[PDB]
Amino acid sequence: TGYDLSNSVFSPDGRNFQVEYAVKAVENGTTSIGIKCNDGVVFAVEKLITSKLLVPQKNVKIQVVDRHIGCVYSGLIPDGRHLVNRGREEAASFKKLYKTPIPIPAFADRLGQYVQAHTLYNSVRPFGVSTIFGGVDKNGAHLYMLEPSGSYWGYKGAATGKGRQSAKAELEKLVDHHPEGLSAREAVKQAAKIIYLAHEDNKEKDFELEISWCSLSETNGLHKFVKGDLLQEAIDFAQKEIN
C-alpha cells in the first residue's frame, strides 16, 4: 500500500485517501450550520470558549463575500480563510467583467473547482474544511455545502463539524414540519436552538453563539450579522428549549 501517503493517488478501490483524511479534520472541528428560509438564508456556528481570556464577541468566524454572500466552515480555520479569500477574488472578477454581483450557484462552482483542483496534484494538500455558504441573488435564496473533495450541492439545510448528526436530525424535523417554508426571523431562532442542541456533543468547554443572515425582506438581500436584541431574543428561545 502507501496509497494514502500522497494526495491525488487513487487507491485500488478508487479513493483518494488524503481527502478522506482531510474529512477527519473537519469532523474534529466545531459545529456550524445553515438554514435556507422563505426569502433568504441563515448561518450559525459554535465557538468554543477555550478560556476566560477570549474577548467575547471579538473572534468572528462567519465571513462575508462580496456584499450578499455569507460563508461559515468547520475544520482548520486558516484553510477556511484561504478559501474565502479566493472566493472574494472570484466574486470581484465576476462583478468586474459582468457588472452584476455573482449568482450563488455561479459562486458555488468557483469554490468547488478551486477545492477540486487541490485534489489533482501531490504538491498540494486538500482543504481541511467543510464550508456552508449562500445568499440571495436574482433567482432567490440558495444554500450550499462544500466538502474537501470539492463536492457540493444545494441544501434545504446543512450542518458539519462534531455535532453534524444531532444538527442533521434537528434540521430534518424542520423540513418535514414546514413544507410551506420557514420565515427568516423564525430560521434565526431555530439556528440558535440547533447550535445549542448540537453543543451536547462537545460539552467540555461552554460556547459562544454567532449567527448571520441574508433575507430579501429582513436585510434587503445583504449579508448582516445578527447582534443585540435579535441575538439575545434567539439565545433565549434556545435556552427555553433545552430546559
The binder of another protein chosen from 5, 54, 60, 120 (CB under 8 A): 60
| 58 touches another protein by CB under 8 A | yes
Quote the CA–CA distance of 101 and 104 in Å, as a whole number. Answer: 9
| 67 touches another protein by CB under 8 A | yes
The binder of another protein chosen from 20, 49, 103, 225 (CB under 8 A): 225
17: Cβ–Cβ under 8 A, 6 or more apart, which residues? 3, 4, 9, 11
Q: How far apart are the first and last CA of the chain?
A: 51
35 in helix, strand or coil? strand
Considering the candidates 1, 30, 31, 119, report the single residue annotated as catalytic. Answer: 30
| 86 touches another protein by CB under 8 A | no
| 32 touches another protein by CB under 8 A | no
Q: Which is nearer to another protein, 64 or 197 (CB)?
A: 64
Find the part of the chain contacting another protein (CB under 8 A) among 42-50, 55-63, 115-123, 229-237.
Answer: 55-63
| 125 touches another protein by CB under 8 A | no
Quote the CA–CA distance of 116 and 131 in Å, as a whole number. Answer: 13
Of 52, 31, 3, 46, the C-alpha closest to 160 is 31
Estimate the share of the chain in helix, then strand, then coil, as percent rounded to the nearest 5: 40, 25, 35
Q: Does 30 qualify as catalytic in the annotation?
A: yes
Count of residues engaged in binding another protein, rule: CB under 8 A: 10
Residue 16 corresponds to which cell in the numbers above? 483518494
The binder of another protein chosen from 25, 33, 45, 64 (CB under 8 A): 64
Which residue ranges make up the site for another protein (CB under 8 A)?
58, 60, 63-64, 66-67, 88, 92, 96, 225
